[PDB]
């Protein structure tokens, strides 16, 4: 056939470029970074009404100060999460401190290109890694299967990413509050989702310095959705 | 873990105003048997370093080959091998010190005490010690084995601290070294009369002296000594 670690004539790794196509098919995940915190939100996208949607875990805690949202082949993310948690805890053990969000992201991204003929293929999942440390404050990173990670003020990944990113382009500014970010994620998720957005098919979360990483209750998110509807009907 | 078989005794050395002097006798002992009388224990590396080695001779010969190999390796893909990127005494020592400590950590030491004497690129005197345990230390005077007990006291009367180094000439330093070698010949049962002496000067370079002998010895007073107490005849 052909090598797994083969370069295309354009100078790209076939398998990495193909894994990016799998991520495009994944459910939408959006992250927005502010000075009051970073918000992470996801489309759950249950394949059937009999599927208990609260068992869909696409937002995940890595440490108290670092959260993570995923999009694509979500099964692939489990070993990445496991490694991230291990890296976070191990660094705390060696250095009696929290690990920097960038350093954690870098540790996860080191796995990405460890494939060949190590694992047999790249990961088919993108991660939005959000967190806080004392040095660089609130941060949001986009970890790809290429091994590259970009820091973002706001970022959308998944099927509705380019439409959502264009929306994030206009909406994001440096003085956003946490509440404003929460509604903004919900607004853009609702825009790109096939099914109608509610507290059962969408999930919110955030990371603040004080309270750390928190996944939002369906009751809490439901209020924010109702608050969103009213403010859009307000003009 | 081994035991030393063929052994070399004291290596002595000291700093002076423009460089360093190092000396060691030409004996390879086999226990109490003075087996080999033509053993060179001062091994020059380039024109700026002399490594003096005591203890196990088979391990010395191994170390001698490592240093020879080091010079070869340094010359590979190195247009400045005989200039800016030549081997320094500090490079040679740190390498040996690494090896010595690694070998002791594997419980298979090189059974030696080593003194690396030389002059650096900037003209600074280099004199540092390393042994089978990987223990390292520097001092205006350094000596191994019996030299530590008998040579150092004499050499320290010349250079007692760092500030005495610029006041000490090569003639005074060499005189003290040569006298110390005589004292060691009087008092070390595993020493020989024949020795080698090396001077590494920042101006005149490396002067390597072979086939030196202990001379001006005092023995005449022995004729008057009779018995062990009461005996007169």
């Amino acid at each position: 056939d052909r090598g797994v670690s083969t370069f295309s004539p354009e100078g790209r790794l076939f398998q990495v470029e193909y894994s990016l196509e799998a991520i495009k098919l994944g459910s939408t995940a959006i992250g927005i970074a502010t000075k009051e915190g970073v918000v992470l939100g996801v489309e759950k996208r249950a394949t059937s009404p009999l599927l208990e949607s609260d068992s869909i875990e696409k937002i995940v805690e890595i440490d108290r100060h670092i959260g993570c949202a995923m999009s694509g082949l979500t099964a692939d993310a489990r070993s990445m999460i496991e490694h991230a948690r291990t890296a976070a805890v191990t660094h705390n053990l060696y250095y009696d401190e929290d690990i920097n969000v960038e350093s954690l992201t870098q540790s996860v991204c080191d796995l990405a290109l460890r494939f060949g003929e190590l694992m047999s293929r790249p990961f088919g999942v993108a991660l939005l890694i959000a967190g806080h440390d004392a040095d660089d404050g609130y941060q949001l990173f986009h970890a790809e299967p290429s091994g590259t990670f970009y820091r973002y003020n706001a970022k959308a990944i998944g099927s509705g990413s380019e439409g959502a990113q264009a929306e994030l382009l206009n909406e994001w500014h440096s003085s956003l509050t946490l509440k404003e970010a929460e509604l903004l994620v919900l607004k853009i998720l609702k825009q790109v989702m096939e099914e109608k957005l509610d507290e059962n098919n969408a999930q919110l979360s955030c990371i603040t310095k004080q309270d750390g990483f928190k996944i939002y209750d369906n009751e809490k998110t439901a209020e924010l959705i109702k608050e969103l509807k009213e403010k859009e009907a307000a003009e | 873990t081994q035991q030393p078989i063929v052994t070399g005794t004291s290596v002595i050395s000291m700093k002076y105003d423009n460089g360093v002097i190092i000396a060691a006798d030409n004996l390879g002992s086999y226990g109490s048997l003075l087996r080999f009388n033509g053993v060179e224990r001062l091994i020059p590396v380039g024109d700026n370093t002399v490594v003096g080695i005591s203890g196990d001779i088979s391990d010395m010969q191994h170390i001698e080959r490592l240093l020879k190999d080091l010079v070869t390796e340094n010359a590979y893909d190195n247009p400045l091998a005989d200039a800016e990127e030549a081997l320094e005494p500090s490079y040679i020592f740190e390498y040996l010190a690494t090896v010595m400590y690694q070998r002791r950590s594997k419980m298979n030491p090189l059974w030696n005490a080593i003194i690396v004497a030389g002059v650096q690129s900037n003209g600074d005197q280099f004199l540092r010690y390393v042994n089978l345990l990987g223990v390292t230390y520097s001092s205006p005077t350094l000596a191994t084995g019996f030299g530590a007990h008998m040579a150092n006291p004499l050499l320290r009367k010349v250079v007692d601290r760092e500030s005495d180094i610029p006041k000490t000439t090569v003639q005074v330093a060499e005189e003290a070294i040569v006298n110390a070698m005589r004292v060691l010949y009087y008092r070390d049962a595993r020493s020989s009369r024949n020795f080698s002496l090396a001077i590494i000067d920042k101006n005149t370079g490396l002067t390597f002296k072979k086939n030196l002998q202990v001379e001006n010895m005092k023995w005449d007073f022995a004729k008057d000594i009779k018995g062990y107490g009461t005996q007169k005849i």
Partner: protein, 231 residues
């Protein structure tokens, strides 16, 4: 065509297409400039962002107090090669109490990249590197290609539109080599060089990345408002 399926296959004209495709990844990468005088060596790198929300990808990596590089192409490969350089620099210091010569650092990178071109299963590195350093023989600038070819130069540029900066340095050769004991003027020449590779976009405060090493100057990277001086 039929001879580009893997790195172990020569073409009928004696070419290694996988290596050439890896070389192509560098051309897609953002421009970075390297230049030196007799006292200092300077890296100037145009950082690339994904979009307006994203950060600008870091281009320059420190390898030791006296050495570092700038990258163009696959950033993870640069991280692997820079990590290897860090270790080799560190091995030299720990074992030999000796700072690693920049020329020897280039020889090590060449050999590491070479093994990836002759063996089955692996792939060539998809990144080009510009290594600057100050060692016992003064200032140095190297250009690394993932084919294995490392070249010592007065100045150079790699990445997209790098030919413009490379021509400028070829003209300015006699001027910038003489900029001794003046770090700011040497950086200016580097910033003016990389400007020849720009189209549409210009050098902003979070766009520009500069690094310098010299006689009494440890390898230090300048980003953010630290490079506003040179815009």
């Amino acid at each position: 065509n039929n001879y580009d399926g893997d790195t172990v296959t020569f073409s009928p004209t004696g070419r290694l297409f996988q290596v050439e495709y890896a070389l192509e990844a560098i051309k897609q990468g953002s421009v970075t400039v390297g230049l030196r005088s007799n006292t200092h060596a300077v890296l100037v790198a145009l950082k690339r962002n994904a979009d307006e929300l994203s950060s600008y990808q870091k281009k320059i990596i420190k390898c030791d107090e006296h050495m570092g590089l700038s990258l163009a192409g696959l950033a993870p490969d640069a991280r692997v090669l820079s990590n290897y350089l860090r270790q080799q620099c560190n091995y030299s210091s720990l074992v030999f109490n000796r700072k690693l010569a920049v020329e020897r650092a280039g020889h090590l990178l060449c050999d590491k990249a070479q093994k990836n071109t002759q063996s089955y299963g692996g792939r060539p590195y998809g990144v080009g590197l510009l290594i600057i350093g100050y060692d016992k023989s003064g200032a140095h600038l190297l250009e690394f290609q993932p084919s294995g070819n490392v070249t010592e130069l007065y100045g150079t540029a790699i990445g997209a539109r790098s030919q413009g900066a490379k021509t400028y340095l070829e003209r300015t050769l006699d001027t910038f080599i003489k900029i001794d004991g003046n770090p700011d003027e040497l950086i200016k020449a580097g910033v003016e060089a990389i400007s020849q590779s720009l189209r549409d976009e210009s050098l902003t405060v979070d766009n520009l990345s500069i690094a310098i090493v010299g006689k009494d100057t440890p390898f230090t990277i300048y980003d953010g408002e630290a490079v506003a001086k040179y815009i």
